[PDB]
């Protein structure tokens, strides 16, 4: 039936059974990026395992650290302080912006429009600069940890973030001019990968793939976890469930992120940054080098880390790609017994076959882009 | 003691499922050396199938047999549909490694292999 | 406002050691800008500055033509920048050595070495721990 294998030669392998130019069967293949994160974590303390989440869904990395942090804090029965919560929200929204830039621009790239990629990855560089100024790493900042945050913000960061938020709007508009009303974009996207709300639900979708079909589900307005309950923002919903609606949703999300960042900056509180419970979060170095108890706690935390009372949780985060979850099982030990990661790309790929019904070979490459398929969160 | 079964009631039905699976394999084998340009001969391939079947002959449990049938069917799928490759199929013969000699002396002389 | 641009350009051209220096610069560093010389390091490199350019091009360096016995007229590496100037060139600071000098400590390298990934003076690893199990040696005379 003109079968073919497409995608490789960047870890995707589709097996496509066509009928002429139409697409009849899409069989994705998985495990080309399966490393064994969920098993390795079982041989590592609750802190030796955090980087793995920065490495999962590697375009945000901090909405990933955040889920693990919230889960371990839910187990420990502690809560981080206001300043940490606000920093964490701010940077989660920044990661949202990064992810949505990534998605829109790689979509337009795999379709053929390539200049937004270069116009926006400069902003991505300018935000990696924040990542580095706060953590020392551009992408994989092991910066958000159970108990709050590692370090405080240097003295010239909020001003820079304000200068950036000033102009990101004009940049989004620069891109929208080219893309949103272009008849060719509308022809490539409109009425593509349509999906109804009930089938989405029963397939296990989350995020833009839900609220582009008229559903109202955002895990920040519902089941909030951080101070998000103290900040205002709108949730854009769609009407037809197509790539164009999802594009517009992601754009308006990039805008609500600026709306949230203005508030986070203006309302940043003072105080500590990590729970002052030195049996969970290490003490400062001066206290470590002058006080006995603080040094003992440092030693134990960095050799045999904090112990977590047994239990189980499922903490969901409204990540840029949807509900990111962690089923975390604990024995009364320094290390976990099981950590299962729920990623949306999983169900999205699962539903790709139905979403590619009555469509050509050149519409599948856009159906994929509309899911923001990263294979780290999938293959794990 | 008493159990709950899987895809069989007794080793007879289990063995006839096994024989159907062997029919399928035996028949398909040459198409593989044709599609993917393997060096080996169909005789070698068929001897290998026989060896991999008799490797699990002592088995008695209908359930332990049904599961092996399931897994062999998975492999046959992966093979008839060209998802495996020359590499995955030649990973059965071990063309690039010497075996642990089955001799107390050949073991003693080199290592602590017991 | 175009003739002023042309004037800025002609001064950018003639702002070097005539045609020879202009060619040298334009062909090693594909750039003919004019900036202020904040300093020069032991190895012959120069470091220029201009605060009206944008962030990332407001500081730069002209490497030496020779470094520890090597014709660096064409071959050039960011590994040539010693630490004190590395820290000002990657904009960790607003202050260069001349005004903010480092801490004079022995056991600090006086001569900087660049990357040696393949040179004959490169790095070869090994174990630093002595022999653990000492064997038995019998005497050199029988019975």
């Amino acid at each position: 039936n003109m079968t073919l294998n497409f995608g490789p030669q960047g870890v995707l392998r589709l097996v496509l059974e066509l009928s002429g130019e139409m697409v009849r069967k899409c069989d994705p293949h998985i495990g080309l990026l399966h490393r064994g994160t969920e098993k390795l974590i079982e041989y590592k303390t609750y802190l030796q395992a955090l980087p793995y989440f920065d490495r999962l869904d590697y375009v945000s990395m901090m909405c990933n650290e955040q889920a693990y942090s919230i889960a371990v804090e839910k187990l420990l029965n502690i809560q981080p302080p206001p300043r940490a919560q606000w920093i964490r929200v701010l940077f989660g929204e920044i990661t949202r912006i990064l992810n949505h830039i990534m998605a829109v621009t790689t979509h337009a790239l795999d379709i053929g429009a390539m200049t937004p990629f270069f116009w926006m990855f400069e902003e991505r560089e300018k935000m990696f600069e924040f990542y580095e100024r706060v953590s020392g790493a551009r992408m994989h900042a092991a910066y958000i940890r159970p108990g709050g945050v590692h370090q405080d913000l240097p003295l010239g960061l909020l001003d820079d973030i304000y200068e950036f938020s000033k102009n990101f709007s004009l940049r989004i508009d620069e891109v929208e001019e080219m893309l949103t009303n272009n008849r060719i974009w509308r022809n490539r996207t409109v009425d593509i990968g349509v999906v109804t709300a009930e089938d989405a639900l029963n397939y296990g979708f989350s995020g833009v793939m839900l609220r582009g079909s008229g559903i109202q589900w955002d895990l920040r307005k519902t089941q909030p976890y951080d101070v998000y309950d103290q900040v205002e923002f709108d949730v854009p919903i769609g009407s037809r469930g197509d790539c164009y609606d999802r594009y517009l949703c992601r754009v308006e999300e990039m805008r609500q992120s600026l709306r949230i960042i203005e508030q986070c900056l203006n309302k940043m509180p003072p105080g500590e940054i990590k729970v002052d419970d030195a049996k969970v979060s290490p003490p400062k170095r001066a206290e470590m080098k002058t006080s006995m108890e603080s040094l003992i706690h440092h030693f134990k935390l960095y050799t045999e880390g904090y112990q977590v009372p047994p239990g189980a949780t499922y903490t969901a985060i409204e990540a840029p790609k949807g509900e990111f979850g962690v089923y975390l099982v604990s024995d009364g030990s320094s290390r976990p017994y099981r950590c299962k990661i729920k990623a949306p790309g999983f169900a999205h790929l699962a539903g790709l076959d139905k979403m590619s019904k009555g469509h050509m070979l050149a519409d599948v490459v856009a159906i994929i882009g509309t899911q923001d398929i990263v294979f780290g969160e999938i293959d794990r | 003691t008493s159990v709950k079964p899987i895809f069989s009631r007794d080793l007879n039905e289990a063995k006839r499922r096994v024989r159907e699976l062997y029919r399928a394999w035996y028949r398909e084998v040459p198409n593989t050396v044709h599609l993917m340009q393997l060096d080996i001969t169909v005789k070698q391939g068929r001897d290998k199938v026989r060896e991999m079947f008799m490797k699990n002959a002592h088995v008695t449990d209908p359930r332990v047999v049904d599961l092996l049938v399931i897994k062999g069917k998975m492999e046959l799928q992966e093979t008839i549909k060209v998802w495996k490759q020359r590499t995955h199929v030649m990973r059965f013969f071990h063309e690039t490694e010497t075996p642990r000699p089955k001799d107390f002396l050949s073991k003693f002389y080199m290592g602590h292999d017991p | 406002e175009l003739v002023e641009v042309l004037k800025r350009g002609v001064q950018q051209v003639t702002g070097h050691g005539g045609l020879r220096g202009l060619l040298r610069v334009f062909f090693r560093a594909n750039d003919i800008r004019i900036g202020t010389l904040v300093g020069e390091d032991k190895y012959g490199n120069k470091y220029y500055e201009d605060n009206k350019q944008f962030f990332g091009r407001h500081r730069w360096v002209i490497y030496t033509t020779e470094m520890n016995g090597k014709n660096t007229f064409w071959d050039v590496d960011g590994s040539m920048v010693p630490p004190e100037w590395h820290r000002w060139l990657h904009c960790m600071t607003d202050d260069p050595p001349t005004t903010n000098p480092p801490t004079a400590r022995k056991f600090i390298w006086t001569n900087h070495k660049f990357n040696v990934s393949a040179t004959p003076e490169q790095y070869v690893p090994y174990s630093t721990t002595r022999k653990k199990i000492h064997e038995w040696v019998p005497p050199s005379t029988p019975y």
């Binding site: - | 340009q37 060096d39 490694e97 080199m110 | -």
Partner: protein
């Protein structure tokens, strides 16, 4: 024995085999297998090269980390051979051309260079030296290559009495100058496989009953040149090359053969299919004895 040599391991890439081998002739066609067989069991391998570093990159992945040491040399340059033979227990020589250049005659290649190699080996204090030659090595030979080979074997034995000469026949594999030479376009042949030859050499590298001896590595079967070339064409410029072609293979009598190292012949009727499918766009050959 030095503890750095005790063969600790399980016979694998990341193991130790106690074999420190300086190998000359690795950039070629048989070294490409000798080095693999040496390294995939955990041996240290010094490789001198004269080529450019690009032509020696197919060998960096056939041995574990740190076991391969690539250094440079020049046959005419002595004191570039001490570097390589020193720090070794075994030396292997595989050099040889199928033609003559300006700087290097058959005399040089097969007599003068191996002699210096063995001299430097003895000077250093190594314990094994392996030299490879042709099966038809003989002073009475239309080809002067074989003349030089049979001279160089003696010139070697005169400095390394306990050496090990190995006379295989026309070798066939991938990137070989025999089947590809035939398919580019009175005499019986018994060819042999690089895999078998390399296994034999790497086994002799340890086997204790191989010193001061010779070995004739020949296949299991024999064929008439015409039947063999027709088999080639069915499955599908040098004077000395054509001379070595138009010579039949000896049946060496009672000489320690291939099955005395432990190896077993691999018939050409099994690897021709993999060697020849590249030259595309059948029944076997009747094995005979004269």
């Amino acid at each position: 024995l030095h503890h750095a040599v005790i063969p600790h391991g399980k016979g694998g890439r990341s193991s130790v085999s106690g074999v420190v081998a300086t190998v000359f002739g690795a950039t070629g066609f048989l070294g490409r297998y000798v080095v693999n067989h040496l390294g995939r069991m955990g041996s240290q391998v010094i490789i001198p090269y004269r080529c450019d570093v690009y032509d020696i990159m197919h060998l960096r992945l056939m041995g574990d980390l740190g076991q391969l040491t690539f250094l440079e040399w020049d046959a005419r340059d002595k004191d570039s051979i001490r570097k390589a033979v020193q720090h070794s227990n075994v030396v292997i020589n595989l050099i040889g051309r199928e033609w003559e250049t300006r700087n290097f005659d058959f005399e040089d290649v097969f007599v003068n260079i191996p002699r210096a190699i063995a001299q430097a080996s003895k000077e250093a204090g190594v314990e094994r030296f392996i030299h490879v030659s042709h099966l038809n090595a003989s002073m009475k030979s239309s080809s002067k290559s074989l003349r030089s080979k049979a001279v160089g074997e003696k010139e070697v034995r005169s400095v390394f009495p306990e050496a090990i000469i190995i006379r295989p026949s026309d070798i066939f594999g991938r990137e070989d100058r025999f089947l590809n030479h035939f398919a580019n376009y009175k005499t019986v042949k018994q060819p042999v496989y690089v895999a078998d030859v390399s296994k034999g050499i790497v086994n002799a590298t340890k086997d204790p009953d191989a010193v001061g001896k010779t070995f004739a590595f020949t296949g299991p079967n024999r064929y008439l040149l015409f039947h063999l070339v027709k088999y080639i064409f069915g499955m599908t410029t040098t004077k000395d090359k054509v001379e070595r072609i138009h010579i039949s293979d000896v049946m060496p009598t009672d000489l320690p053969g291939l099955e005395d190292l432990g190896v077993q012949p691999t018939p050409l009727e099994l690897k021709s299919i993999e060697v020849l499918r590249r030259h595309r766009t059948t029944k076997p050959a009747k094995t005979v004895n004269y």
